[PDB]
Design an enzyme around this catalytic site. Structure first.
Site, PDB file in Angstrom:
ATOM      1  CD  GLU A 117      15.998  26.500   9.538  1.00 23.23           C
ATOM      2  OE1 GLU A 117      15.827  27.247   8.547  1.00 23.23           O
ATOM      3  OE2 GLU A 117      17.130  26.166   9.951  1.00 23.23           O
ATOM      4  CG  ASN A 261      10.950  28.411   2.977  1.00 23.15           C
ATOM      5  OD1 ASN A 261      11.075  27.608   3.932  1.00 23.15           O
ATOM      6  ND2 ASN A 261      10.487  29.623   3.104  1.00 23.15           N
ATOM      7  CD  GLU A 294      17.626  33.587   4.559  1.00 25.12           C
ATOM      8  OE1 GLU A 294      17.566  32.374   4.376  1.00 25.12           O
ATOM      9  OE2 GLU A 294      17.705  34.123   5.701  1.00 25.12           O
ATOM     10  CG  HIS A 297      20.882  29.085   3.719  1.00 24.39           C
ATOM     11  ND1 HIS A 297      21.674  28.216   4.441  1.00 24.39           N
ATOM     12  CD2 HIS A 297      20.406  29.984   4.615  1.00 24.39           C
ATOM     13  CE1 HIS A 297      21.655  28.573   5.708  1.00 24.39           C
ATOM     14  NE2 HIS A 297      20.881  29.628   5.827  1.00 24.39           N
ATOM     15  CD  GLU A 316      21.470  28.929   9.219  1.00 21.88           C
ATOM     16  OE1 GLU A 316      21.966  30.009   8.743  1.00 21.88           O
ATOM     17  OE2 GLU A 316      20.355  28.462   8.862  1.00 21.88           O
TER      18      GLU A 316
END
Ligand SMILES: CCCCC[C@H](CC(=O)NO)C(=O)N[C@H](C(=O)N1CCC[C@H]1CO)C(C)C
Ligand code: NA
Ligand SMILES: [Zn+2]
Length: 866
Positions: A117, A261, A294, A297, A316
């Site tokens: 990213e 990820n 994370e 996400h 975000e």
């Protein structure tokens, strides 16, 4: 280095649906074979344009035909005359060992790991490196078994084998289509903490935390926080994890905090590793929030991703909102809110007035890695929070449900998300959308009138946003403006008008408007912008007594803290102007008494008291001023500390002693008590020198946890106490082999008030625990000096600037992402006096002239020098 614009977005001419990667891994030369199934969506004659950076192309085939109709250009492989559907096969080489920027595939110690990213996958192979291209990945990894016994990528293991000459391979498949920024690869030798989480519907998830050999003792808190995050997302948002395995790898070399990820998060080890003797309460709660972030996400970023990088706040802002809500629900909501508001007012507002000002959804970008900003993240979250304020939780969760129902499996926009919220809730967000497109901080001015004859209270509210460097035109926003009205006894007055209740969230939508409230029996004391209900500056002419009243009576803990900030602001501004004229601190007795009352009030949550007793940072103080005098700010902060320590000495020591805890636990009540006790210590350090020295030295030596040890150490530094050099050396001697723990010490060195701080910082470039190759060390010594010691950074001789130029000259070539975060203090030049501006402008001009200036720095420098 050419700007790109949000309004130029166009759907891709080609999609890639499936990609099969093989990596033949070696640190000096990695061979990548990428087989992609492509489909043309655009015009028949449109070429396929693949991004690639620093790749050695070996071969290009289209349905196994070696291709001739192609060319390489700057950043690209452009392939012409293609069929409508085909198999692309690319072979290329990369060199992880040479990768000092830590973007793409690189080394972290002896491990190999990735950062993709925003636009890192194009440093691994030629691809459609844009987040609206979503493909099903399979990944095969071939390597030396002894060097790389763990070979990890996204998803599940589907094949494995052994080969001649000590090499082995593992193949992974991730069933969910993803943009390539969510690709990850890790190879190395690790210890692995393994556990399980069972979802509310019964899916059992294997949890695996990979850490450097010998760090298993520092893994269980991160594992616990992962389970906590998963449970909370189920309970609060109804979201379950969607795969069978959740891998986290902690690496020492990482530009960012961590990365989401899919199924294979890669974390900077700062945000995983904790033990009570190495990590503070703040580190524990930061590990909790970053693990959470994370994890969150997985839905807000991965299951629904971003159409284009201008929509970064879609994921975000919303994921930061989620991590705040998680932290706030599990721990202290007030302390979380207070701290997020401190960031907004003291750091984000500064950005929004700077030459890098942008809306949360930017319009123009040269290097996307420069837009991982306080604005996109923190202001982004405040925007999501405004929707939450406007809709309420139930409607807000309806909008989340409609957002996922509509966009699951796709790449979406900010506008899509607002529309889901508007459509599920039936609240009109048309005007509200302007928060996405307008930069700058609104200033909200409030006047009030009480009419005893009609028992009416009138608020006259106005807004404006000053022009910013990026936008000459500004318009009024939809500002949710929360109030509460207090009678003489501290009881809330019902809001009503014309015989009907009035919602306490006022819709401030015009440049100027009036709100009238009836049946107001007593002249009220208002609490305004409750819980920082919009990200705005508030101008209201508070009396000191109104503020100390709120500090004693306000219903929401946040309001008590906020009233204390407004009380202090007046006197911070007073004393900065006095400092500039050579005059000593002046503070009315009744101000000191307000903080005395906080110390002695047994009914106040110690979590809240600790925050009221923590003075604004030098960054937060800078926001109060049209022109920043960083030396005056620093000296006034110290003088105020000393004045309070003298006036409140007995009470401080009493409260310090009362909150002593012999057991250490990482539990919220305990943390709050420690924060109070250590807030007391900070003042006591600045009292009479001998008592201070003894108290501080004893806490450092007797602490049974790093929270209390570092608090003492940090006070020895702050107050320049006699014991300082001996304690600082003890810490180095004990902890020098542990970079994460030494980061705390580098920060204390960098932020030291000592006259010779720059000389010390330069000398620490050669320290045994420092290295220019490690982002965390850079940030801890160099970033902390420039960003968190503005008094020294802005030394009148210009020595801070010269030092930063030297460091940036190195980092521009080594690690542009880290360089670009570090240049930020220099781009604030127009906030400083003319002679400082001249010196900062000369430093920027020197960097502008660097051979091989990175795009990262170029973007910032050009804005600053405009
Ligand atoms: C709670 C979420 C914050 C941690 C993760 C984010 C990155 C991210 O969004 N991952 O999903 C980050 O690195 N953010 C940056 C950050 O926190 N950094 C960058 C360097 C290390 C760390 C502390 O400065 C800021 C400056 C944008
Ligand atoms: Na290969
Ligand atoms: Zn994030």
């Amino acid at each position: 280095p050419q700007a790109k614009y949000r309004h130029d977005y166009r759907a891709p001419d080609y999609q890639i649906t499936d990609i099969d990667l093989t990596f033949d891994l070696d640190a000096q030369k990695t061979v990548v074979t990428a087989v992609s199934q492509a489909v043309r969506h655009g015009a028949s004659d449109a070429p396929l344009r693949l991004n690639g950076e620093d790749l050695k192309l070996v071969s290009v085939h289209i349905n196994d035909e070696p291709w001739t109709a192609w060319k390489e250009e700057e950043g690209a492989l452009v392939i012409s005359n293609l069929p409508e559907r085909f198999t692309l096969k690319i072979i290329n080489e990369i060199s992880p060992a040479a990768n000092t920027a830590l973007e793409g595939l690189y080394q972290s110690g002896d491990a190999l790991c990735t950062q993709c990213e925003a636009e890192g996958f194009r440093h691994i192979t030629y691809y459609l490196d844009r987040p609206d291209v979503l493909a099903r990945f399979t990944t095969k990894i071939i390597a030396d078994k002894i060097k790389y016994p763990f070979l990890l990528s996204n998803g599940n293991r589907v094949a494995q084998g052994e080969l001649e000459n000590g090499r082995h391979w593992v193949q992974w498949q991730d069933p969910f289509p993803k943009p390539c920024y969510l690709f990850a690869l890790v190879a190395g030798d690790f210890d692995v903490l393994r556990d399980t989480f069972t979802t509310r519907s019964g899916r059992e998830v294997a949890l695996e935390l990979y850490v450097d050999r010998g760090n298993l003792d520092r893994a269980p808190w991160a594992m616990t926080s992962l389970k906590n995050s998963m449970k909370w997302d189920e309970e609060r948002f109804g979201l379950e994890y969607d795969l069978d395995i959740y891998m986290i790898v902690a690496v020492d070399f990482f530009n960012m905090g961590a990365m989401e990820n899919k199924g294979l998060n890669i974390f900077n080890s700062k945000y995983v590793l904790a033990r009570t003797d190495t990590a503070t309460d703040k580190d524990y709660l930061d590990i909790e929030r970053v693990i959470g972030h994370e994890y969150f996400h997985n839905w807000t970023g991965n299951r629904v991703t971003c159409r284009d990088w201008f929509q970064l706040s879609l994921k975000e802002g919303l994921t930061v909102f989620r991590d705040q809500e998680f932290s706030s629900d599990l721990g202290s909501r007030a302390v979380n809110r207070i701290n997020n508001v401190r960031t907004m007012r003291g750091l984000q507002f500064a950005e929004d007035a700077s030459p890098m000002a942008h809306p949360i959804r930017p319009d123009m970008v040269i290097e996307m890695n420069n837009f991982y900003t306080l604005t996109v993240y923190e202001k982004g979250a405040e925007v999501i929070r405004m929707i939450h304020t406007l809709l309420g939780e139930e409607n807000f969760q309806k909008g989340m449900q409609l957002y996922f129902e509509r966009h699951d499996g796709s790449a979406a926009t900010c506008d899509d998300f607002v529309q889901a919220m508007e459509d599920a809730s039936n609240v009109d967000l048309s005007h509200f959308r302007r928060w996405y497109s307008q930069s700058g901080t609104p200033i909200v001015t409030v006047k009030d009138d009480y009419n005893p004859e009609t028992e009416q209270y009138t608020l006259t509210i106005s807004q404006r946003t000053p022009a910013t460097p990026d936008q000459a035109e500004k318009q009024p926003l939809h500002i949710p403006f929360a109030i509460e009205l207090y009678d003489n006894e501290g009881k809330v007055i019902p809001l009503q008008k014309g015989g009907h209740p009035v919602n306490s969230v006022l819709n401030v939508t015009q440049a100027e408007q009036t709100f009238v409230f009836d049946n107001v029996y007593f002249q009220p004391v208002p609490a305004l912008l409750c819980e920082f209900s919009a990200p705005v500056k508030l101008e209201y002419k508070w009396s000191d007594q109104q503020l100390t009243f709120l500090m004693r009576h306000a219903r929401n803990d946040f309001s008590r803290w906020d009233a204390a900030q407004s009380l202090l602001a007046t006197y911070i501004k007073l004393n900065v102007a006095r400092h500039q004229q050579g005059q000593p601190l002046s503070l009315p007795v009744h101000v000191a008494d307000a903080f005395r009352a906080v110390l002695l009030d047994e009914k106040i949550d110690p979590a809240l008291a600790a925050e009221i007793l923590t003075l604004p940072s030098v960054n937060e103080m800078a926001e109060l001023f049209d022109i920043i005098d960083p030396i005056a700010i620093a000296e006034v902060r110290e003088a105020l500390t000393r004045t309070l320590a003298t006036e409140l000495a007995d009470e401080l020591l009493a409260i310090y002693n009362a909150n002593y805890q012999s057991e250490y636990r990482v539990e919220h009540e305990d943390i709050a008590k420690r924060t109070l006790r250590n807030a007391c210590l900070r003042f006591l350090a600045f009292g009479e020198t001998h008592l201070a020295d003894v108290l501080v030295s004893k806490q450092f030596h007797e602490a049974n946890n790093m929270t209390d040890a570092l608090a003492a150490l940090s006070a020895a530094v702050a107050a320049q106490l006699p014991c300082r050099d001996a304690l600082m050396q003890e810490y180095d001697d004990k902890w020098h082999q542990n970079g994460l723990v030494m980061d705390k010490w580098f920060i204390l060195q960098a932020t030291s008030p000592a006259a010779n701080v720059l000389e010390t910082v330069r000398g620490l470039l050669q320290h045994r625990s420092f290295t220019m190759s490690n982002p965390n060390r850079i940030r801890s010594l160099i970033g902390a000096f420039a960003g968190s010691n503005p008094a020294a950074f802005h030394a009148e001789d210009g020595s801070g600037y010269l030092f930063l130029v030297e460091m940036l000259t190195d980092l521009n070539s080594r690690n542009p992402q880290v360089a670009s975060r570090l240049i930020e203090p220099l781009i604030r030049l127009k906030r400083y006096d003319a002679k400082r501006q001249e010196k900062m402008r000369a430093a920027l001009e020197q960097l502008k002239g660097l051979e091989n200036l990175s795009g990262d720095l170029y973007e910032k420098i050009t804005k600053a020098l405009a």
